[PDB]
Design a protein around this ligand. Structure first.
Ligand SMILES: O=C(O)c1ccc2c(C3CCCCC3)c(-c3ccccc3)n(CC(=O)N3CCOCC3)c2c1
Ligand SMILES: [Mn+2]
Ligand SMILES: [Mn+2]
Length: 512
């Protein structure tokens, strides 16, 4: 069946968009191009590898006990900036236990328990995301009303935050900080006698997800020891929301129908991860890959296994890809065998090596700096809710480009505007933090360790990537950033107290 059906009505914006300040932001203007790509018929033929893997997953899920969240708990865990309801209240009302919101949520719940069939309305919007140089169309976000979103948490918050790690164990990517992710990848790589590995990523994953896939996920969730009401709400949410439903634009017009994964529901990430893990594990068996270890984050997969030889590996990956295609998930680009861990990119990131103060080799997570640099450029001119600049400083603190360029420029701009002490909103790990730039050394030490302030002797490949990136984007080269940083450092040190702590830790690398 078709992943989508369209009426002709447009995906409209709900606010003023901006598609320029080179660096561009996606808008609703491109929605049609995206719609075209994500619209197709899914063919899926399952086999005994898929069935065997599924049985093993259910047996693990069957050891999980999950509870219902109360309305009040689900309200308190609602993110503060999520879209207001159509029924007269918003996130702030939900979070402060307003009677208007609570009573509507109780009524949505009762309807979920009493009606297990009627498709539930969703809004479809174009995502506004900043990229660098052709242009990629906007991604589509599909989400139901706030009152339903609270009810999803009631039924499934305890399940989605518990079950995946039990079912997928060490392969569940979302349990790891970056250093832990690196540690898993490196320890896995080093455990093989002749390691080979590859990243896989599905072309339009959400659209490849079938009704059967979504019901298989529900059947996994129902293997949990759940309360009777949970079982009913989960079934109802599955039939009425997860398998599909109608789409409405921001102007209240009917855009069409969805028969695939919604990107804006509580189960998107856990569901996608479970479903990719299931198809990928089955595909590894068809491919007959030896001593396979998987790492899964949504539909970004890394597989590390024992090499069978060059031509053998190349053919085994073609068989892997063939099986994934049969299960409904063809790749955006065909996977390639890699014999160097550093060359495997997944979740837009890769492992690299530097050295600590003692001269010990330290592995850390990095990425191509093009998109982070472009996003930071944008947030120099405009201003956003997410502050991707600051998030990247935190998540990629050990990297050469975050330390030399991102930290330098942003502490320079903060010195210049006297806004050192002003908290900024920052979206990291699904949650919205209010971060004080002077809190950064503690945040980085906690997340990465003290060595993040002392790494040096980076790999030549990574230094050159950063250098080619600066050159391509017209930004000063690294020698300029070292000079500027000595100036930023001297400045912070003059200010004493906590600013002197930022100069000491964040810019220890710039000293002679
Ligand atoms: O000359 C500088 O001192 C400087 C400083 C910073 C930047 C940046 C960003 C780097 C990361 C931190 C935020 C600022 C850019 C830049 C980077 C990516 C995409 C667009 C601009 N650029 C490039 C840039 O703004 N342009 C426009 C003017 O001339 C060449 C390209 C920077 C230049
Ligand atoms: Mn994909
Ligand atoms: Mn992906």
């Amino acid at each position: 069946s078709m992943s989508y059906t369209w009426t002709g009505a447009l995906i409209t914006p709900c606010a003023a968009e901006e598609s320029k300040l080179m660096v561009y932001a996606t808008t609703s203007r491109s929605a049609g191009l995206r719609q075209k790509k994500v619209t197709f018929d899914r063919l899926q033929v399952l086999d005994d590898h898929y069935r065997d893997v599924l049985k093993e997953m259910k047996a693990k899920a069957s050891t999980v006990k999950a509870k219902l969240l109360s309305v009040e708990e689900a309200c308190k865990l609602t993110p503060p900036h999520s879209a207001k309801s159509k029924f007269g209240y918003g996130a702030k009302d939900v979070r402060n236990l307003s009677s208007k919101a609570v009573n509507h949520i109780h009524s949505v719940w009762k309807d979920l328990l009493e009606d297990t069939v009627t498709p539930i309305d969703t809004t479809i919007m174009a995502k506004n995301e900043v990229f660098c140089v052709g242009r990629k169309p906007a991604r589509l976000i599909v989400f139901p009303d706030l009152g339903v979103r609270v009810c999803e948490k009631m039924a499934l918050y305890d399940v989605v935050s518990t079950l995946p790690q039990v079912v997928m164990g060490s392969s569940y990517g979302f349990q790891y900080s970056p250093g832990q992710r690196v540690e898993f990848l490196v320890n896995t790589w080093k455990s093989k006698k002749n390691p080979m590995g590859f990243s896989y990523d599905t072309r339009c994953f959400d659209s490849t997800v079938t009704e059967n896939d979504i019901r298989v996920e529900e059947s996994i969730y129902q293997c949990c020891d759940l309360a009777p009401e949970a079982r009913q709400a989960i079934k109802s949410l599955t039939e009425r929301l997860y398998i599909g439903g109608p789409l409405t634009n921001s102007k209240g017009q009917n855009c069409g129908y969805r028969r695939c994964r919604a990107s804006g529901v509580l189960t998107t990430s856990c569901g996608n991860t479970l479903t990719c893990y299931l198809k990928a594990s089955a595909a590894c068996r068809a491919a007959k890959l030896q001593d396979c270890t998987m790492l899964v984050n949504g539909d970004d997969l890394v597989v590390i296994c024992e090499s069978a030889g060059t031509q053998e590996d190349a053919a085994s990956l073609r068989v892997f890809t063939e099986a994934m295609t049969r299960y409904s998930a063809p790749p955006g680009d065909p996977p390639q065998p890699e014999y160097d861990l550093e060359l495997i990119t997944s979740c837009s990131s890769n492992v690299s090596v530097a050295h600590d103060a003692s001269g010990k080799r330290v592995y850390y997570l990095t990425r191509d700096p093009t998109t982070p640099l472009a996003r930071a450029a944008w947030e120099t001119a405009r201003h956003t809710p997410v502050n991707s600049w600051l998030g990247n400083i935190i998540m990629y603190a050990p990297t050469l480009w975050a330390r030399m360029i991102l930290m330098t420029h942003f502490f320079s701009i903060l010195l210049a505007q006297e806004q050192l002490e002003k908290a900024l909103d920052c979206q990291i790990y699904g949650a919205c933090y209010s971060i004080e730039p002077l809190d950064l050394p503690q945040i980085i030490e906690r997340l990465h360790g003290l060595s993040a302030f002392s790494l040096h002797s980076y790999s030549p490949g990574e230094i050159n990537r950063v250098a080619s990136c600066l050159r391509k984007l017209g930004v000063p080269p690294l020698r300029v950033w070292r000079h500027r940083a000595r100036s930023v450092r001297a400045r912070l040190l003059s200010q004493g107290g906590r600013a002197a702590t930022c100069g000491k830790y964040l810019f220890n690398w710039a000293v002679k």
